[PDB]
């Protein structure tokens, strides 16, 4: 069997591969979100840039998990990547709501894997998640919550004006 | 006849001269648009700057075509330049709509000339248009479409507020 | 319909979306190839680095196609991404053979789309492929062919020695 | 009526618009002159550069007049731009003679507008012309007269030799 | 057969090899032209430098074609190189006329190969010629036409004086 | 006759022209050798670079001889350039053997011309060869002999491994 594998359960190995799939799916979702906002009939550059950046960030998360799988002696296994849940993402508000829902799902998956590692007495795994994923996830969800609140405050009765102002004055553009 | 002319049809030569006229007309149109927005009773500096820049850009397109005519051994022939279609250009939205209509007409003229060059087995002409005009045109029309969408989003029920905000936060002024 | 779309066929729009899928599949394939060579029981860093780089390069190709779809007024549509053809990629030679097969398939897809654009009198599309994809593809396939020849020359009767030497002295590592 | 217009006659406003037309016509004339000398069968780069520069200079004069129209509360009105008087401009001597004739016509138009402003007790107009146009015009006509004299001195009995020498040793080229 | 060759006709491969021969012949012709003007009894350094430079430029064209042959999987085949058409090249005018004749022949060969690539649906070939050869050729023929006109203008009745002046004031010397 | 020619025999003049032909033939041979090693099915970059460099070096030798012909008042005469002896050059060993054979032939030609100059009491010629050709030739043949010995040492029973190692560790690449 593996010459380096030690204290690395089959259960954790499988869960890591599933988590890689989840992160790549999230990256793909953010890629779709970005290009939707880049449409000439949507045209919100700051929103495009926000989600494009998250596409890369989520890809990097998957990359780190895959590197860690190999570091531990596990075998990276790739599966089909489901397309995103939507072809069109509606308003900035709709999109940011979809993003927070996705991020909560990823966070729960992180917490689930952490719990499995704790149950299997796998502290390297637990520390890996703590050091590179849990706090980043909490920070990202807080930022999205901040955005949702500001987008919501701007809806009022002139949605287009508010949508433009949020993109121009909160989101980075360029 | 010409000591350098080779594989350069009379049809292409004439079409290039017509295209120069079209670009100079477009430049003149943008000059008028710019000075309209510079009026004390319109006063939208970013809109003035946008169209002034396009006046120069379209002049440069005509200049390149004229240089290419000479490079190929054709004879630059100038015609009268019709004045712009309007003396007053209305709102930013009206102006950006007129601009996109003009740009589509120029693009179709480019595509028509490309087709003629393809039919006449004139690859230098085809490459000239591809390298210096087709993509610039597509990029400019995309940018105008982006603007139209943002201007439209801002109209709502407070048109003046939206017109000001678009000029201040999207258009370059400074 | 679209405010910017001009001379952009439904056929080309669909083919671009299919081509994006093909490039993302190729990126995913190269991601798998890279992590296989990063395994402690394969351990060929230069080979890992070669394929990791191609993963990013192919992602960038998909990104460019998606940007161009939007520039032309088409609608980016994402589909499921099939997993790679293999979970384990064998020797460097096996992997480089699989890579050249994949690259030839992408090249044929580029040539097919170019032919469609030529038939539809879509010179922007044709120039886009010529300027950013055809030559890069030819250059990459030539490099892989060079590698295959050097890997093959090294097989002889001491395959492990040759596999190590190729990774150490040809491929960039570290 | 205008919120800024003060001491600005309808007569001056109209005359400024006519003068803009004259300057744009002159720019167009110089554009034609430049491209004629850029022909492979004329090939006098210094002469091409001289007239190209004047095309831009005359455009800038029109631009300044248009800015001043708006500064004063007048309305810029554009008219059709007649093509140049000739398609082919003959020798350098013929061209420089045509240029001096054109410049004298512009100068008389400046003097006429100055006289109108003096009659209408419009000192801003008078100072505008004095500060940005009268002396530039006198300086340009003196330079052309200098050139005409040197071109004439060179005609003698070897016109081609003289035409080449003037372009090479007087005119700026590279 | 070739492990990389794709969409590369035998007809194009052969034509590329013929074109390499034509460019090397042109380089050799320019080498002879340069050394003729370097003779103590001709002594026109600027003319020597002009043609020497073109010798290198045409060699570089052949080099690029040969690199492209290999990039595409074709086989470079070299043939005998015919000596130049003349041992002595007469006047600068005679030489520049011979040069423009040679350049037109190369240009027609480029156009012929482009047409073959178009007929064979070989867009890499077509783009290769468009990007690195067609415009360079048009620019070079325009420059020679410019020179021919200036040399012709100087002939008059004092040919030696004009020949010296052209070399000293137009051609670069060092 | 020549205004500068002094102590320059017709025999030496003719022999110099023959020697120019020999050097250009050698350059052409090295050009073919380089592009053979650049093939995707040969792929030895260091070997390609070695012979490409020699192509230029031998061209420079011909250039120097031609400059010297003119310096002495002789007339450069160009002849047809025979194609190389082979279309395919086999192994690195085969190629380096062919190169040393070619270089010995050039060296004998240099020695023959030196002997002719000595017999004709032409010390400028003799010094020209001594200063710019004899030692360069001896140094190049020594380097090739060094290479042949190292290539031969590597053949043993694993020729491919040795051929790769020589290219990677002796020849400059990357
Ligand atoms: O030489 C130049 C430079 C410019 C410029 F771009 F700098 F403004 C230029 C601009 C315009 C011109 C012309 C121009 O001629 C000559 C033909 C008529 N015309 C009408 C449209 C605006
Ligand atoms: O935004 C990015 C950036 C990258 C990267 F190139 F940086 F790795 C990236 C890479 C891959 C991706 C995706 C990626 O999305 C989203 C679609 C699915 N997918 C599978 C193949 C590998
Ligand atoms: O490698 C080089 C470099 C040059 C150069 F451009 F530097 F002069 C070069 C130039 C010429 C050549 C060759 C040359 O081969 C080889 C083929 C025959 N040939 C005849 C025309 C002049
Ligand atoms: Cl599956
Ligand atoms: Cl008319
Ligand atoms: Cl689905
Ligand atoms: Cl009218
Ligand atoms: Cl033969
Ligand atoms: Cl012969």
From Swiss-Prot, chains A, B, C, D, E, F:
Keywords: Acetylation, Cytoplasm, Cytoplasmic vesicle, Iron, Iron storage, Lysosome, Metal-binding. The modification N-acetylserine is found at residue 1. It is found in: Cytoplasmic vesicle, Autophagosome; Cytoplasm; Autolysosome. Its main location: cytoplasm. InterPro entries: Ferritin, Ferritin-like, Ferritin-like_diiron, Ferritin-like_SF, Ferritin_CS, Ferritin_DPS_dom. Residues 6-155 form the Ferritin-like diiron domain. One of its GO terms (cellular component) is autolysosome. GO terms for molecular function: ferric iron binding; ferrous iron binding; iron ion binding. One of its GO terms (biological process) is intracellular iron ion homeostasis. The keyword Iron applies. In horse spleen the light chain is the major chain. Belongs to the ferritin family. Oligomer of 24 subunits. There are two types of subunits: L (light) chain and H (heavy) chain. The major chain can be light or heavy, depending on the species and tissue type. The functional molecule forms a roughly spherical shell with a diameter of 12 nm and contains a central cavity into which the insoluble mineral iron core is deposited. Interacts with NCOA4. Stores iron in a soluble, non-toxic, readily available form. Important for iron homeostasis. Iron is taken up in the ferrous form and deposited as ferric hydroxides after oxidation. Also plays a role in delivery of iron to cells. Mediates iron uptake in capsule cells of the developing kidney. Delivery to lysosomes by the cargo receptor NCOA4 for autophagic degradation and release or iron. This is Ferritin light chain. It comes from Equus caballus (Horse).
């Amino acid at each position: 069997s593996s010459q380096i594998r030690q204290n690395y359960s089959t259960e954790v190995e499988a869960a890591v591969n599933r988590l890689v799939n989840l992160y790549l799916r999230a990256s793909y979702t953010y890629l779709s979100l970005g290009f939707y906002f880049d449409r000439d009939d949507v045209a919100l550059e700051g929103v495009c840039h926000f989600f494009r950046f998250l596409a890369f960030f989520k890809f990097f998360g998957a990359f780190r998990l895959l590197k860690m799988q190999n570091q531990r002696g596990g075998r990276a296994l790739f599966q089909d990547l489901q397309k995103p849940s939507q072809d069109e993402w509606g308003t900035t508000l709709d999109a940011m709501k979809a993003a927070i829902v996705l991020e909560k799902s990823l966070n729960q998956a992180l917490l689930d894997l952490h719990a499995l590692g704790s149950a299997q007495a796998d502290p390297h795994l637990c520390d890996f998640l703590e050091s590179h994923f849990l706090d980043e996830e909490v920070k990202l969800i807080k930022k999205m919550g901040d955005h949702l609140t500001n987008i919501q405050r701007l809806v009022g009765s002139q949605a287009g004006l508010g949508e433009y102002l949020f993109e121009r004055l909160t989101l980075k553009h360029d």
